[PDB]
Structure 1
Amino acid sequence: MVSKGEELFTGVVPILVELDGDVNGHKFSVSGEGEGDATYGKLTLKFISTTGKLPVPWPTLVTTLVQCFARYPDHMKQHDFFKSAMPEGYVQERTIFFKDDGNYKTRAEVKFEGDTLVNRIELKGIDFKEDGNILGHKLEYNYFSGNVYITADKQKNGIKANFKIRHNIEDGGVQLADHYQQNTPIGDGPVLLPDNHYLSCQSKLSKDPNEKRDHMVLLEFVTAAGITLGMDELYK
């Protein structure tokens, strides 16, 4: 059946994101506006630095700056926890370990305000090297992909997830970021607790040529995968 959460994502939903961040004492704020189309798992957003200059590279904030917009194939629709928690929303907590560097700890509330999907985030980064790849702004600004591996967590009535992101470095190397993640529903109603699966994500980063503030234009595609259910036998 069309469960109640999925009904809110059949069309284009406007998106607001607000992030307060503190990395090694540098405080910043990011405001993002855009839209999501879960039918195609498509995100189009523009983020602006409102406090001033970012102490960290924009690509390291991508994974933090709304997985309820993932496209779950029909045969996987019973494993979409994120939509099933709507409109009351969910709390998403993450720890991002940057290899041989500091770590982010993020707490976000994702919920509907009227017809708008809203993501309010607080981020705290610690133990970062001053001349490292993050604070030294040594990372490339282009594109990256990710496979978010999701398992259920019925004790907290939510989900857990892990993944690895490999950010290209300007010299040619790789900055590794290990994400560990937990999501818990905000309401007390029933939610879909999924079998193991993953989200294939692709993120393209660009710049508005007319924008003079520190900003990031992001185009994202997120598709659930990892469950066949026997869709191969249908065609002999």
Structure 2
Amino acid sequence: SKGEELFTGVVPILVELDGDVNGHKFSVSGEGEGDATYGKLTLKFICTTGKLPVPWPTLVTTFVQCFSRYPDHMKRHDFFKSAMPEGYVQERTIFFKDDGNYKTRAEVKFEGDTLVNRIELKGIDFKEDGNILGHKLEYNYNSHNVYIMADKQKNGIKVNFKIRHNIEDGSVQLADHYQQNTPIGDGPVLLPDNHYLSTQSALSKDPNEKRDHMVLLEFVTAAGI
């Protein structure tokens, strides 16, 4: 396919987010690199408007699936890379159990040789005293499976999954994800058979960094075929 060749080495990544959660406005910038050969991502995010109003972990999924490692035998199912360099639109709705929801819209594509993820986030109906606004989530992250399916009507894919956020009291905060991706260009893309992505992520901090930020290491590989 098209994009395949674009991912053959380490690619620099730029992440830009504009958000509003219950009237609290904020901006985030992130930079790093991805190496789809190992399904590996390394990023650092910085809250540019000051203190992040929600917990960092809640934004992970929002902050580039084209960096997933697809095994040789599954290359024909890699929609993400097939949409490059023109890119794709990724939209979601994220429902926090017994809490508010996030609505996101992003464009992911290449600007020169940098892979760009530009997002607009809108959060509503959050409880001032819930796990999100109340900042009760631990600073860590779990492994998940992300289910993918073809959408022949929109020439895209539909994706669904649940994230499990650990709460400081030992409990769990569920986050139901509903997602749609559609190509930006008019060129051909690869529509996949049902399959899934297996994820793992580690969160850390930069000891010498005074701004509000998050350091992220993540591995993702496709499976189920």
Shift of 1:142: 1.7
Give the superposition deviation at 1:144: 1.6
Q: Which is greater in Rg?
A: 1
Contact 2:87 2:183 in 1 (8 A): yes
Equivalenced residue count is 225
| CA deviation vs aligned residue, 1:48-85 (integer Å, no higher than 9, x gap) | 00001111000000000000000000000000000000
User: Contact 2:155–2:182 (CA<8 Å) still a contact in 1?
Assistant: yes
Does the 8 Å contact 2:13/2:114 carry over to 1? yes
Following TM superposition, the consecutive aligned residue runs of length 4 or more in structure 1 with deviations greater than 2 angstroms are none
How far has the Cα of 1:203 moved from its partner?
1.1
Residue 195 of structure 2 contacts residue 224 of structure 2 at CA under 8 Å; is this kept in 1? yes
Separation in 2, partners of 1:195, 1:60: 29
Are 2:2 and 2:83, in contact at CA under 8 Å, matched by a contact in 1?
no
Q: Percent identity?
A: 95
The runs of 5 or more residues in structure 1 that have no matched partner are 228-236
**CA offsets per residue over residues 156-182 of structure 1, 9 Å max, x none?**
101000000010000100000000000
Offset from partner CA, 1:85-141 (integer Å, 9 cap, x none)? 000000000000000000000000000000100000000000000000000000000
CA distance in 2, matches of 1:44, 1:164: 23
TM-score, length-scaled by structure 1: 0.95
State the alpha-carbon separation in 1 of the partners of residues 198 and 133 from structure 2.
Answer: 28
Q: Distance in 2 between matches of 1:191 and 1:108?
A: 19
Secondary structure of the equivalent of 1:140? coil
Q: Distance in 1 between matches of 2:92 and 2:149?
A: 15
Q: Distance in 1 between matches of 2:73 and 2:83?
A: 19
Contact 2:16–2:117 (8 Å) recurs in 1: yes
Question: Structure 2: how far apart are the matches of 1:128 and 1:207?
Answer: 27
Q: Secondary structure at the match of 2:188?
A: coil
Consecutive unaligned residues of structure 2, counting only runs of 5 or more, are none
Q: Is the 8 A contact 2:202 2:216 kept in 1?
A: yes
Per the TM alignment, residue 4 of structure 1 is displaced from its structure 2 partner at its CA by 2.1
Match of 1:4 in 2: 2
SS at match of 1:201: strand
- 1:87 maps to what in 2? 85
Which whole-Å CA distance do the structure 2 matches of 1:158 and 1:177 have between them? 23
Residue 97 of structure 1 is matched in structure 2 by: 95
Could you tell me whether the CA contact under 8 Å between 2:19 and 2:122 is conserved in 1? yes
How far residue 143 of structure 1 moved from its aligned partner, in angstroms, is 2.4
Q: What TM-score, normalized to structure 2?
A: 0.99
